[PDB]
Amino acid sequence: SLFLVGERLNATGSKRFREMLFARDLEGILALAREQVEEGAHALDLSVAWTGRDELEDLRWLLPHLATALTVPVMVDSTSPEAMELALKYLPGRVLLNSANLEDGLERFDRVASLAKAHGAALVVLAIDEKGMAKTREEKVRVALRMYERLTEHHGLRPEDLLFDLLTFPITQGDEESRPLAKETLLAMEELRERLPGVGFVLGVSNVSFGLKPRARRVLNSVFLDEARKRGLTAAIVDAGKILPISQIPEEAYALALDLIYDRRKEGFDPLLAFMAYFEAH
């Protein structure tokens, strides 16, 4: 029952979308939106924020057309609550707000939660607070519980209104510190599923593979997605067309992907170098 959220209308994550947004190529944007729906997406991530630009202008330009070109739900992806309000005016009954978090303290968190409650929007709850991103499973649990309590007890939101984003970090580039980060999220997710029955979980799957070649990315994302699903993932922000079913992944690449995800370093063997080795030699 995986709710796929197309990742491609994201100025930060998508060169193609950035180009078209810059060019004011409306028809290219609407086509790319429709294409993701056809490739399996049930909803579309939307982020227009970028260096210098009046995010509220870009949204005022795009939203009226986007809202009437498709009926799919839109995950409004923005750090401005005003931007969220604007998107809610154009997309009533169709919005997921990304995100409520505590990076700027309680008031901004509450502003986003209030909007979600008042408009009937689903809420992405992101594991960043006043001391930063939750990297370990212990940090992820501590932040999530505090936010869960605030959202249920104070705002009257139901577990089922909520998609907890426990953070997807690139486990490429070989850093000691970053190798276990996907494991931490997967293990925290399983634990929070038990602790918080009824909440959803979402991840930006494609972050996990950032820095690798395209084939390696497709495989790692698809295996990570599948492993997250087993831990209780309910939704994923993805390039829906580029998700491989597990059966379509060669057994070696699949096994090396699981090695990289779970950080199964032993002396004689680096799963990162081994995973990259497979491709280029296939």
PDB file of C-alpha atoms in Angstrom:
ATOM      1  CA  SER A   1       0.000   0.000   0.000  1.00  0.00           C
ATOM      2  CA  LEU A   2       2.865   2.361  -0.832  1.00  0.00           C
ATOM      3  CA  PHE A   3       1.758   5.942  -1.510  1.00  0.00           C
ATOM      4  CA  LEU A   4       4.224   7.189  -4.125  1.00  0.00           C
ATOM      5  CA  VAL A   5       4.936  10.898  -4.248  1.00  0.00           C
ATOM      6  CA  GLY A   6       6.638  11.971  -7.460  1.00  0.00           C
ATOM      7  CA  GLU A   7       9.868  13.830  -6.678  1.00  0.00           C
ATOM      8  CA  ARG A   8      10.432  15.686  -9.956  1.00  0.00           C
ATOM      9  CA  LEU A   9       8.708  19.091  -9.518  1.00  0.00           C
ATOM     10  CA  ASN A  10      11.461  20.115  -7.098  1.00  0.00           C
ATOM     11  CA  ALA A  11      13.657  23.048  -8.065  1.00  0.00           C
ATOM     12  CA  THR A  12      16.450  21.769  -5.776  1.00  0.00           C
ATOM     13  CA  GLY A  13      16.278  18.084  -6.762  1.00  0.00           C
ATOM     14  CA  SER A  14      15.410  18.425 -10.456  1.00  0.00           C
ATOM     15  CA  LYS A  15      17.524  20.209 -13.105  1.00  0.00           C
ATOM     16  CA  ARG A  16      14.802  19.640 -15.729  1.00  0.00           C
ATOM     17  CA  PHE A  17      12.147  21.257 -13.523  1.00  0.00           C
ATOM     18  CA  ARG A  18      14.461  24.099 -12.525  1.00  0.00           C
ATOM     19  CA  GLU A  19      15.176  24.871 -16.242  1.00  0.00           C
ATOM     20  CA  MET A  20      11.469  24.895 -17.076  1.00  0.00           C
ATOM     21  CA  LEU A  21      10.540  26.985 -14.004  1.00  0.00           C
ATOM     22  CA  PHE A  22      13.239  29.511 -14.939  1.00  0.00           C
ATOM     23  CA  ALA A  23      12.094  29.527 -18.578  1.00  0.00           C
ATOM     24  CA  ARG A  24       8.402  29.837 -17.516  1.00  0.00           C
ATOM     25  CA  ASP A  25       7.740  26.752 -19.637  1.00  0.00           C
ATOM     26  CA  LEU A  26       4.255  25.988 -18.306  1.00  0.00           C
ATOM     27  CA  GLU A  27       3.501  23.160 -20.747  1.00  0.00           C
ATOM     28  CA  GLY A  28       6.742  21.320 -20.018  1.00  0.00           C
ATOM     29  CA  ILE A  29       5.958  21.489 -16.290  1.00  0.00           C
ATOM     30  CA  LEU A  30       2.356  20.250 -16.727  1.00  0.00           C
ATOM     31  CA  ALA A  31       3.650  17.405 -18.950  1.00  0.00           C
ATOM     32  CA  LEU A  32       6.285  16.392 -16.410  1.00  0.00           C
ATOM     33  CA  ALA A  33       3.569  16.408 -13.729  1.00  0.00           C
ATOM     34  CA  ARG A  34       1.303  14.205 -15.897  1.00  0.00           C
ATOM     35  CA  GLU A  35       4.241  11.928 -16.808  1.00  0.00           C
ATOM     36  CA  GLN A  36       4.970  11.100 -13.139  1.00  0.00           C
ATOM     37  CA  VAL A  37       1.279  10.245 -12.585  1.00  0.00           C
ATOM     38  CA  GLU A  38       1.465   7.876 -15.613  1.00  0.00           C
ATOM     39  CA  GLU A  39       4.693   6.297 -14.264  1.00  0.00           C
ATOM     40  CA  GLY A  40       2.927   5.381 -10.987  1.00  0.00           C
ATOM     41  CA  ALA A  41       2.936   8.461  -8.701  1.00  0.00           C
ATOM     42  CA  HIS A  42      -0.225   8.980  -6.564  1.00  0.00           C
ATOM     43  CA  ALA A  43       0.776  12.542  -5.644  1.00  0.00           C
ATOM     44  CA  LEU A  44       3.385  15.115  -6.580  1.00  0.00           C
ATOM     45  CA  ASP A  45       6.037  16.846  -4.486  1.00  0.00           C
ATOM     46  CA  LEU A  46       6.207  20.561  -5.293  1.00  0.00           C
ATOM     47  CA  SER A  47       9.144  22.803  -4.316  1.00  0.00           C
ATOM     48  CA  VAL A  48       9.843  26.043  -6.207  1.00  0.00           C
ATOM     49  CA  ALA A  49      12.182  27.661  -3.633  1.00  0.00           C
ATOM     50  CA  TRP A  50      15.578  28.722  -5.009  1.00  0.00           C
ATOM     51  CA  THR A  51      18.231  31.437  -4.485  1.00  0.00           C
ATOM     52  CA  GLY A  52      16.818  34.974  -4.976  1.00  0.00           C
ATOM     53  CA  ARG A  53      13.379  34.160  -6.380  1.00  0.00           C
ATOM     54  CA  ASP A  54      10.062  35.286  -4.909  1.00  0.00           C
ATOM     55  CA  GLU A  55       8.812  31.753  -4.025  1.00  0.00           C
ATOM     56  CA  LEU A  56       5.360  33.349  -3.618  1.00  0.00           C
ATOM     57  CA  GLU A  57       5.528  34.705  -7.220  1.00  0.00           C
ATOM     58  CA  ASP A  58       6.596  31.333  -8.644  1.00  0.00           C
ATOM     59  CA  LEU A  59       3.753  29.656  -6.703  1.00  0.00           C
ATOM     60  CA  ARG A  60       1.273  32.359  -7.794  1.00  0.00           C
ATOM     61  CA  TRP A  61       2.351  31.703 -11.409  1.00  0.00           C
ATOM     62  CA  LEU A  62       2.318  27.846 -11.302  1.00  0.00           C
ATOM     63  CA  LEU A  63      -0.443  26.810  -8.837  1.00  0.00           C
ATOM     64  CA  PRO A  64      -3.556  28.016 -10.701  1.00  0.00           C
ATOM     65  CA  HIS A  65      -2.483  25.929 -13.724  1.00  0.00           C
ATOM     66  CA  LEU A  66      -1.220  22.944 -11.746  1.00  0.00           C
ATOM     67  CA  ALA A  67      -4.453  22.779  -9.700  1.00  0.00           C
ATOM     68  CA  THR A  68      -6.654  22.590 -12.777  1.00  0.00           C
ATOM     69  CA  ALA A  69      -4.309  20.482 -14.980  1.00  0.00           C
ATOM     70  CA  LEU A  70      -4.451  17.482 -12.608  1.00  0.00           C
ATOM     71  CA  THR A  71      -6.544  16.188  -9.743  1.00  0.00           C
ATOM     72  CA  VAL A  72      -3.706  14.401  -7.875  1.00  0.00           C
ATOM     73  CA  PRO A  73      -2.684  15.441  -4.354  1.00  0.00           C
ATOM     74  CA  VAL A  74       0.284  17.818  -4.045  1.00  0.00           C
ATOM     75  CA  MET A  75       2.922  17.662  -1.317  1.00  0.00           C
ATOM     76  CA  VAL A  76       3.676  21.352  -0.820  1.00  0.00           C
ATOM     77  CA  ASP A  77       7.336  21.436   0.055  1.00  0.00           C
ATOM     78  CA  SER A  78       8.430  24.757   1.541  1.00  0.00           C
ATOM     79  CA  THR A  79       9.986  26.390   4.633  1.00  0.00           C
ATOM     80  CA  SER A  80       7.591  29.404   4.359  1.00  0.00           C
ATOM     81  CA  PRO A  81       4.201  29.032   6.106  1.00  0.00           C
ATOM     82  CA  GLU A  82       2.838  31.796   3.832  1.00  0.00           C
ATOM     83  CA  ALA A  83       3.801  29.673   0.823  1.00  0.00           C
ATOM     84  CA  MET A  84       1.884  26.791   2.417  1.00  0.00           C
ATOM     85  CA  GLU A  85      -1.188  29.021   2.977  1.00  0.00           C
ATOM     86  CA  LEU A  86      -1.155  30.102  -0.655  1.00  0.00           C
ATOM     87  CA  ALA A  87      -0.897  26.503  -1.891  1.00  0.00           C
ATOM     88  CA  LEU A  88      -3.787  25.553   0.402  1.00  0.00           C
ATOM     89  CA  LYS A  89      -6.005  28.231  -1.226  1.00  0.00           C
ATOM     90  CA  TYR A  90      -5.420  26.719  -4.666  1.00  0.00           C
ATOM     91  CA  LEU A  91      -5.438  23.025  -3.627  1.00  0.00           C
ATOM     92  CA  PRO A  92      -8.243  22.462  -1.047  1.00  0.00           C
ATOM     93  CA  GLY A  93      -8.600  18.801   0.022  1.00  0.00           C
ATOM     94  CA  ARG A  94      -5.463  17.750  -1.923  1.00  0.00           C
ATOM     95  CA  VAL A  95      -2.463  18.910   0.166  1.00  0.00           C
ATOM     96  CA  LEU A  96       0.235  17.285   2.204  1.00  0.00           C
ATOM     97  CA  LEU A  97       2.308  19.888   4.039  1.00  0.00           C
ATOM     98  CA  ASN A  98       6.033  19.264   4.039  1.00  0.00           C
ATOM     99  CA  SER A  99       6.919  19.864   6.803  1.00  0.00           C
ATOM    100  CA  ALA A 100       6.233  20.556  10.446  1.00  0.00           C
ATOM    101  CA  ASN A 101       9.582  20.570  12.264  1.00  0.00           C
ATOM    102  CA  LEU A 102      11.204  22.265  15.210  1.00  0.00           C
ATOM    103  CA  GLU A 103      14.380  23.765  13.622  1.00  0.00           C
ATOM    104  CA  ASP A 104      13.090  27.295  14.401  1.00  0.00           C
ATOM    105  CA  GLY A 105      11.381  26.432  17.697  1.00  0.00           C
ATOM    106  CA  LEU A 106       7.854  25.725  18.791  1.00  0.00           C
ATOM    107  CA  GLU A 107       6.023  28.656  17.140  1.00  0.00           C
ATOM    108  CA  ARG A 108       6.844  27.848  13.500  1.00  0.00           C
ATOM    109  CA  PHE A 109       6.069  24.147  14.201  1.00  0.00           C
ATOM    110  CA  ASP A 110       2.689  25.144  15.631  1.00  0.00           C
ATOM    111  CA  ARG A 111       1.953  27.451  12.686  1.00  0.00           C
ATOM    112  CA  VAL A 112       2.350  24.562  10.216  1.00  0.00           C
ATOM    113  CA  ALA A 113       0.457  22.080  12.393  1.00  0.00           C
ATOM    114  CA  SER A 114      -2.378  24.601  12.808  1.00  0.00           C
ATOM    115  CA  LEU A 115      -2.667  24.931   9.040  1.00  0.00           C
ATOM    116  CA  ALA A 116      -2.755  21.161   8.590  1.00  0.00           C
ATOM    117  CA  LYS A 117      -5.440  20.778  11.246  1.00  0.00           C
ATOM    118  CA  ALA A 118      -7.574  23.693  10.025  1.00  0.00           C
ATOM    119  CA  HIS A 119      -7.441  22.830   6.283  1.00  0.00           C
ATOM    120  CA  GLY A 120      -7.640  19.021   6.639  1.00  0.00           C
ATOM    121  CA  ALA A 121      -4.172  18.501   5.163  1.00  0.00           C
ATOM    122  CA  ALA A 122      -1.879  15.547   5.903  1.00  0.00           C
ATOM    123  CA  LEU A 123       1.362  16.550   7.615  1.00  0.00           C
ATOM    124  CA  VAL A 124       4.929  15.524   7.037  1.00  0.00           C
ATOM    125  CA  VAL A 125       6.647  15.591  10.438  1.00  0.00           C
ATOM    126  CA  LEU A 126      10.406  15.928   9.937  1.00  0.00           C
ATOM    127  CA  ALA A 127      12.953  14.846  12.560  1.00  0.00           C
ATOM    128  CA  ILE A 128      14.883  18.136  12.924  1.00  0.00           C
ATOM    129  CA  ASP A 129      14.628  20.218  16.105  1.00  0.00           C
ATOM    130  CA  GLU A 130      16.483  23.125  17.734  1.00  0.00           C
ATOM    131  CA  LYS A 131      19.718  21.088  17.988  1.00  0.00           C
ATOM    132  CA  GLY A 132      19.571  19.902  14.379  1.00  0.00           C
ATOM    133  CA  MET A 133      18.960  16.777  12.360  1.00  0.00           C
ATOM    134  CA  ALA A 134      18.366  13.483  14.167  1.00  0.00           C
ATOM    135  CA  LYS A 135      21.123  11.165  12.876  1.00  0.00           C
ATOM    136  CA  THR A 136      21.079   8.203  15.291  1.00  0.00           C
ATOM    137  CA  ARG A 137      18.085   5.984  16.042  1.00  0.00           C
ATOM    138  CA  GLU A 138      18.028   7.323  19.611  1.00  0.00           C
ATOM    139  CA  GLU A 139      17.861  10.986  18.406  1.00  0.00           C
ATOM    140  CA  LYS A 140      15.157  10.034  15.868  1.00  0.00           C
ATOM    141  CA  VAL A 141      12.986   8.511  18.585  1.00  0.00           C
ATOM    142  CA  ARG A 142      13.498  11.427  21.013  1.00  0.00           C
ATOM    143  CA  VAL A 143      12.508  14.058  18.430  1.00  0.00           C
ATOM    144  CA  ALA A 144       9.570  12.049  17.003  1.00  0.00           C
ATOM    145  CA  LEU A 145       7.942  11.442  20.369  1.00  0.00           C
ATOM    146  CA  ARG A 146       8.086  15.107  21.328  1.00  0.00           C
ATOM    147  CA  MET A 147       6.534  16.111  18.012  1.00  0.00           C
ATOM    148  CA  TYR A 148       3.934  13.306  18.144  1.00  0.00           C
ATOM    149  CA  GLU A 149       2.829  14.438  21.623  1.00  0.00           C
ATOM    150  CA  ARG A 150       2.579  18.085  20.522  1.00  0.00           C
ATOM    151  CA  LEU A 151       0.594  17.227  17.365  1.00  0.00           C
ATOM    152  CA  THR A 152      -1.862  14.776  18.979  1.00  0.00           C
ATOM    153  CA  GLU A 153      -2.322  16.445  22.386  1.00  0.00           C
ATOM    154  CA  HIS A 154      -2.184  20.150  21.506  1.00  0.00           C
ATOM    155  CA  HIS A 155      -3.368  20.315  17.891  1.00  0.00           C
ATOM    156  CA  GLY A 156      -5.855  17.413  18.033  1.00  0.00           C
ATOM    157  CA  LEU A 157      -4.266  15.734  14.974  1.00  0.00           C
ATOM    158  CA  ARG A 158      -4.731  11.993  14.588  1.00  0.00           C
ATOM    159  CA  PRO A 159      -1.820   9.560  14.142  1.00  0.00           C
ATOM    160  CA  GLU A 160      -3.200   8.811  10.672  1.00  0.00           C
ATOM    161  CA  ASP A 161      -2.952  12.522   9.595  1.00  0.00           C
ATOM    162  CA  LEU A 162       0.855  12.237  10.051  1.00  0.00           C
ATOM    163  CA  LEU A 163       3.824  11.088   7.952  1.00  0.00           C
ATOM    164  CA  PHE A 164       7.004  10.941  10.043  1.00  0.00           C
ATOM    165  CA  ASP A 165      10.148  11.674   8.039  1.00  0.00           C
ATOM    166  CA  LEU A 166      13.069  10.225   9.949  1.00  0.00           C
ATOM    167  CA  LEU A 167      15.619  11.568   7.388  1.00  0.00           C
ATOM    168  CA  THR A 168      17.424  10.008   4.439  1.00  0.00           C
ATOM    169  CA  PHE A 169      21.189  10.773   4.310  1.00  0.00           C
ATOM    170  CA  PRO A 170      23.569   9.932   1.461  1.00  0.00           C
ATOM    171  CA  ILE A 171      25.528   6.821   2.530  1.00  0.00           C
ATOM    172  CA  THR A 172      27.961   7.329  -0.364  1.00  0.00           C
ATOM    173  CA  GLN A 173      31.290   9.246  -0.244  1.00  0.00           C
ATOM    174  CA  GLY A 174      32.718   6.782   2.337  1.00  0.00           C
ATOM    175  CA  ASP A 175      32.678   8.925   5.522  1.00  0.00           C
ATOM    176  CA  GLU A 176      33.005   7.006   8.760  1.00  0.00           C
ATOM    177  CA  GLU A 177      30.189   9.137  10.192  1.00  0.00           C
ATOM    178  CA  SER A 178      27.730   8.753   7.262  1.00  0.00           C
ATOM    179  CA  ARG A 179      28.032   4.969   6.518  1.00  0.00           C
ATOM    180  CA  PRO A 180      25.448   3.812   9.128  1.00  0.00           C
ATOM    181  CA  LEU A 181      22.873   6.598   8.590  1.00  0.00           C
ATOM    182  CA  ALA A 182      20.334   4.612   6.519  1.00  0.00           C
ATOM    183  CA  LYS A 183      20.447   1.753   9.016  1.00  0.00           C
ATOM    184  CA  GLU A 184      19.709   4.218  11.836  1.00  0.00           C
ATOM    185  CA  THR A 185      16.583   5.415  10.010  1.00  0.00           C
ATOM    186  CA  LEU A 186      15.365   1.891   9.213  1.00  0.00           C
ATOM    187  CA  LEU A 187      15.859   0.728  12.795  1.00  0.00           C
ATOM    188  CA  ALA A 188      14.241   3.912  14.232  1.00  0.00           C
ATOM    189  CA  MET A 189      11.311   3.417  11.830  1.00  0.00           C
ATOM    190  CA  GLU A 190      10.605  -0.133  13.055  1.00  0.00           C
ATOM    191  CA  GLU A 191      10.818   1.035  16.651  1.00  0.00           C
ATOM    192  CA  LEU A 192       8.539   4.043  16.058  1.00  0.00           C
ATOM    193  CA  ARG A 193       5.966   1.853  14.210  1.00  0.00           C
ATOM    194  CA  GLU A 194       5.523  -0.101  17.467  1.00  0.00           C
ATOM    195  CA  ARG A 195       5.694   2.923  19.777  1.00  0.00           C
ATOM    196  CA  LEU A 196       3.269   5.027  17.631  1.00  0.00           C
ATOM    197  CA  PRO A 197       0.595   2.744  16.118  1.00  0.00           C
ATOM    198  CA  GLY A 198      -1.340   4.414  13.302  1.00  0.00           C
ATOM    199  CA  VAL A 199       1.241   6.990  12.141  1.00  0.00           C
ATOM    200  CA  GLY A 200       2.596   6.902   8.617  1.00  0.00           C
ATOM    201  CA  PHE A 201       6.232   7.136   7.578  1.00  0.00           C
ATOM    202  CA  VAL A 202       7.715   8.876   4.527  1.00  0.00           C
ATOM    203  CA  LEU A 203      11.241   9.190   3.137  1.00  0.00           C
ATOM    204  CA  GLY A 204      12.993  11.024   0.340  1.00  0.00           C
ATOM    205  CA  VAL A 205      14.392   7.723  -0.955  1.00  0.00           C
ATOM    206  CA  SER A 206      16.660   9.175  -3.680  1.00  0.00           C
ATOM    207  CA  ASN A 207      18.851  11.050  -1.132  1.00  0.00           C
ATOM    208  CA  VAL A 208      20.363   7.701  -0.014  1.00  0.00           C
ATOM    209  CA  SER A 209      22.223   7.211  -3.317  1.00  0.00           C
ATOM    210  CA  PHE A 210      23.304  10.817  -4.035  1.00  0.00           C
ATOM    211  CA  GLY A 211      26.771  10.908  -5.632  1.00  0.00           C
ATOM    212  CA  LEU A 212      26.605   7.543  -7.479  1.00  0.00           C
ATOM    213  CA  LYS A 213      26.144   6.818 -11.184  1.00  0.00           C
ATOM    214  CA  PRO A 214      22.513   6.534 -12.430  1.00  0.00           C
ATOM    215  CA  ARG A 215      22.315   2.690 -12.578  1.00  0.00           C
ATOM    216  CA  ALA A 216      23.813   2.316  -9.102  1.00  0.00           C
ATOM    217  CA  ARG A 217      21.319   4.956  -7.860  1.00  0.00           C
ATOM    218  CA  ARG A 218      18.265   3.139  -9.280  1.00  0.00           C
ATOM    219  CA  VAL A 219      19.269  -0.116  -7.592  1.00  0.00           C
ATOM    220  CA  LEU A 220      20.202   1.373  -4.212  1.00  0.00           C
ATOM    221  CA  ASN A 221      17.008   3.473  -4.067  1.00  0.00           C
ATOM    222  CA  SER A 222      14.858   0.500  -4.972  1.00  0.00           C
ATOM    223  CA  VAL A 223      16.392  -1.796  -2.367  1.00  0.00           C
ATOM    224  CA  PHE A 224      16.342   0.940   0.292  1.00  0.00           C
ATOM    225  CA  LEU A 225      12.676   1.580  -0.549  1.00  0.00           C
ATOM    226  CA  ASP A 226      11.916  -2.122  -0.196  1.00  0.00           C
ATOM    227  CA  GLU A 227      13.753  -2.366   3.146  1.00  0.00           C
ATOM    228  CA  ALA A 228      11.943   0.744   4.423  1.00  0.00           C
ATOM    229  CA  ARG A 229       8.618  -0.800   3.377  1.00  0.00           C
ATOM    230  CA  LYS A 230       9.423  -3.846   5.562  1.00  0.00           C
ATOM    231  CA  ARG A 231      10.061  -1.516   8.557  1.00  0.00           C
ATOM    232  CA  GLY A 232       6.673   0.201   8.146  1.00  0.00           C
ATOM    233  CA  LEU A 233       7.128   2.802   5.387  1.00  0.00           C
ATOM    234  CA  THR A 234       3.716   4.059   4.164  1.00  0.00           C
ATOM    235  CA  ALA A 235       4.863   6.666   1.603  1.00  0.00           C
ATOM    236  CA  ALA A 236       7.952   7.536  -0.439  1.00  0.00           C
ATOM    237  CA  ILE A 237       9.119  10.561  -2.346  1.00  0.00           C
ATOM    238  CA  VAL A 238      10.568   8.963  -5.463  1.00  0.00           C
ATOM    239  CA  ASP A 239      11.126   9.072  -9.203  1.00  0.00           C
ATOM    240  CA  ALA A 240       8.277   6.537  -9.719  1.00  0.00           C
ATOM    241  CA  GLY A 241       9.346   5.533 -13.239  1.00  0.00           C
ATOM    242  CA  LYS A 242      12.864   4.630 -12.019  1.00  0.00           C
ATOM    243  CA  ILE A 243      11.901   2.225  -9.185  1.00  0.00           C
ATOM    244  CA  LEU A 244      12.952  -1.342  -9.997  1.00  0.00           C
ATOM    245  CA  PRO A 245      10.988  -4.234  -8.563  1.00  0.00           C
ATOM    246  CA  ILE A 246      13.286  -6.434  -6.435  1.00  0.00           C
ATOM    247  CA  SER A 247      12.838  -9.407  -8.823  1.00  0.00           C
ATOM    248  CA  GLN A 248      14.379  -7.289 -11.631  1.00  0.00           C
ATOM    249  CA  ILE A 249      17.615  -6.621  -9.696  1.00  0.00           C
ATOM    250  CA  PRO A 250      20.539  -9.061 -10.289  1.00  0.00           C
ATOM    251  CA  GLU A 251      21.154 -11.066  -7.094  1.00  0.00           C
ATOM    252  CA  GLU A 252      24.733  -9.808  -6.702  1.00  0.00           C
ATOM    253  CA  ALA A 253      23.769  -6.108  -6.995  1.00  0.00           C
ATOM    254  CA  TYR A 254      20.868  -6.772  -4.614  1.00  0.00           C
ATOM    255  CA  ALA A 255      23.173  -8.397  -2.004  1.00  0.00           C
ATOM    256  CA  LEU A 256      25.844  -5.688  -2.298  1.00  0.00           C
ATOM    257  CA  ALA A 257      23.062  -3.040  -1.945  1.00  0.00           C
ATOM    258  CA  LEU A 258      21.933  -4.627   1.334  1.00  0.00           C
ATOM    259  CA  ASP A 259      25.614  -4.651   2.413  1.00  0.00           C
ATOM    260  CA  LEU A 260      25.933  -0.921   1.700  1.00  0.00           C
ATOM    261  CA  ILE A 261      22.576  -0.129   3.391  1.00  0.00           C
ATOM    262  CA  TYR A 262      23.366  -2.067   6.543  1.00  0.00           C
ATOM    263  CA  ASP A 263      27.047  -0.995   6.552  1.00  0.00           C
ATOM    264  CA  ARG A 264      28.490  -4.517   6.560  1.00  0.00           C
ATOM    265  CA  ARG A 265      32.144  -3.569   6.493  1.00  0.00           C
ATOM    266  CA  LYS A 266      34.547  -6.331   7.334  1.00  0.00           C
ATOM    267  CA  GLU A 267      38.270  -6.142   6.814  1.00  0.00           C
ATOM    268  CA  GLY A 268      38.914  -7.046   3.403  1.00  0.00           C
ATOM    269  CA  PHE A 269      35.715  -5.552   2.222  1.00  0.00           C
ATOM    270  CA  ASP A 270      34.136  -2.157   1.607  1.00  0.00           C
ATOM    271  CA  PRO A 271      30.495  -2.509   0.433  1.00  0.00           C
ATOM    272  CA  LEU A 272      30.565   0.968  -1.139  1.00  0.00           C
ATOM    273  CA  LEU A 273      33.553   0.210  -3.402  1.00  0.00           C
ATOM    274  CA  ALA A 274      32.088  -3.280  -4.018  1.00  0.00           C
ATOM    275  CA  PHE A 275      28.688  -1.819  -5.047  1.00  0.00           C
ATOM    276  CA  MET A 276      30.274   0.693  -7.437  1.00  0.00           C
ATOM    277  CA  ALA A 277      32.570  -2.081  -8.769  1.00  0.00           C
ATOM    278  CA  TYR A 278      29.562  -4.215  -9.845  1.00  0.00           C
ATOM    279  CA  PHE A 279      28.398  -1.508 -12.295  1.00  0.00           C
ATOM    280  CA  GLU A 280      31.121  -0.248 -14.731  1.00  0.00           C
ATOM    281  CA  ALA A 281      31.970  -3.999 -14.843  1.00  0.00           C
ATOM    282  CA  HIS A 282      28.426  -5.031 -16.036  1.00  0.00           C
TER     283      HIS A 282
END
